Ligand binder design. Structure first.
Ligand SMILES: [Mn+2]
Ligand SMILES: [Mn+2]
Ligand SMILES: [Mn+2]
Ligand SMILES: [Mn+2]
Lengths: 199, 199, 199, 199
């Protein structure tokens, strides 16, 4: 298919002072760019392996496909989850769901914060939608393992907790990065993803 | 190119009393057949996903491809590793390599036996060839994960220690199964795989 | 406090024709006994390592502790989940919860059956209780990994799908074993575990 | 036992300009300090669980013990592997082993460099000693999984490739950090670790 690096929907500095411009420029133009490129490389090798029926070659490529393929997915969603006009709380049916499933908005933040802080190593924190049960669910994933591909849950809000997402600004203090990132969350997109899961 | 269940090179009862016909008949005609057929199904689903660039669908299918693809691979080699004319010890350059890398033939047996008994759950014990280092190496693998695809080693001799491989005859006592199987090892084939990697 | 193999609450043949006596006799007196004894051995080695602060020795032993410790746990619950007076459906608050969380009793069976058949390799299928969310949840676990220790869910009903649990009687056809086992499920005990978590 | 943060054997800035002082101060006083403290917390909970025979509690703590316990080990070794007087190449029996097992010193650097660059996520690159085979071996480990505890190999040289080890200075360009770190390698310690493995 030939995957492409999506244009960022805002200037690299639109999220200051919560997430500085230096990070956004590295995260999009270097890190995300690397996942896409290698993903394109990986898929071409796999197409060859399928045509030859080289099952060994297919399995050796799996780690690279899940890693870079996941990277493309997770960051492509992540950018839309942030916005200079973001922050505050959601409204409408999403807020009603957060109240029902978690009790309140502040308790949801605490649990998703804890999931993101609890990730041991590199990974992501996620708010997702469980189609089968029809309710919200928090989950964490290691490295770039994607939410939907590995768990079946539909991503609504993702928090990147790889050190490159915050270290330059917040150093080892991951909890400050989590507290600041709530200021730029684009609940308008999260709502769309939530409403999309329902008929 | 569709994958097919290979014919067994000997009668189902050619390995009695070491491995009874009921095991060999179920192991080949029931267990192996299902991995192959399902692999063909998975490869069709995967090819569809690759053509659309659906990275989510590709990642969700990986387990079924590694499991059944590995199952097809592992059993296809396993059958060639056994023969009614087998047993005894190898000769030639293979025996010289086993002496050099493991000390003696009896020490290699202890090491591969120990690795195979050590599998916690289902898996396989393997003697393999490390191309980069140019020597023999034993490894164990879980479920139907294939050796070469996950480790880079070239499979020479595989021991299936899934319970369906022996339970009917030896029940829970895997060490009795391991003791019996050495009498039907096709050292003529193991040598062929070994000499092929060297040049 | 040393761990001990619990006595089976019924004769080895009390579950015929659903689970023959030969399976029950091997499963309890051979398989379960080994996990317990080895667990006692592992705990002694681990206690020695902890007292010396040998973190290396502690980490190297973790697999043996999770495997045999889980094996002891899982089987000790499994035996209580079966009874010759079992079968049929549950009643009371447990049945109401199954209807609310899964739709109906027949839908819960399909979901737990599907989860148990889906185990690739050895493992267990579980119905569990999520304390935080306060509802039922199905999960599968590999090898002898215990439910509560790895997921936080309280085990209510476990289905052992290790091949030694059924192969002698049903051979490779796990769906026949799953079909038969529902007739001996001790819904009286499953309820007791459920009501204990609620207050 | 009560583990303690070892004093660093040199000033935070003794490795400039290869590894700046800001990193060394964060890496030792914040990151390494966190692993120790939580490790002490984890071991106390485990001592309680062993005395009560709470096997569930033991397994729930395993991730925390391997993570922080490994962190203490890996960094405690890492500091001794660097030195302001470091760099260059080793001599004596270690260099002879590197020539025999890898071909040359430059080829060893390429392979250990590649292993360190290849780590997907957080982890470590290692040169180790295989006691059984009596030769050197390169391996990578994810997160803080320790070499000896998980593979049996004796650590000789470890390369920390967690992003916090280099990002502030080298940003996303991990390969530059690897090229620079060769300038401060304390081969005097690596030799001691190597000679210790031999009688
Ligand atoms: Mn990222
Ligand atoms: Mn098999
Ligand atoms: Mn069992
Ligand atoms: Mn570190």
């Amino acid at each position: 298919m030939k995957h492409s690096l999506p244009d960022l929907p805002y200037d690299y500095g639109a999220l200051e002072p919560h997430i500085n411009a230096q990070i956004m420029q590295l995260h999009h133009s270097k890190h995300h760019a690397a996942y896409v490129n290698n993903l394109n490389v990986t898929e071409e090798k796999y197409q060859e392996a399928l045509a030859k029926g080289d099952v060994t070659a297919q399995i050796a490529l799996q780690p690279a496909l899940k890693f870079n393929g996941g990277g493309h997915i997770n960051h492509s969603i992540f950018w839309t989850n942030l916005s200079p006009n973001g922050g505050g709380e959601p409204k409408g049916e999403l807020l009603e769901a957060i109240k029902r499933d978690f009790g309140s908005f502040d308790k949801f933040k605490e649990k998703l914060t804890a999931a993101s802080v609890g990730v041991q190593g590199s990974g992501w924190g996620w708010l997702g939608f469980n189609k089968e049960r029809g309710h919200l669910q928090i989950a964490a994933c290691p490295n770039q393992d994607p939410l939907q591909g590995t768990t079946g849950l539909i991503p609504l809000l993702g928090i990147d907790v790889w050190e490159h997402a915050y270290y330059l600004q917040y150093k080892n203090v991951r909890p400050d990065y989590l507290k600041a990132i709530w200021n730029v969350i684009n609940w308008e997109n999260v709502t769309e993803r939530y409403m999309a899961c329902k008929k």
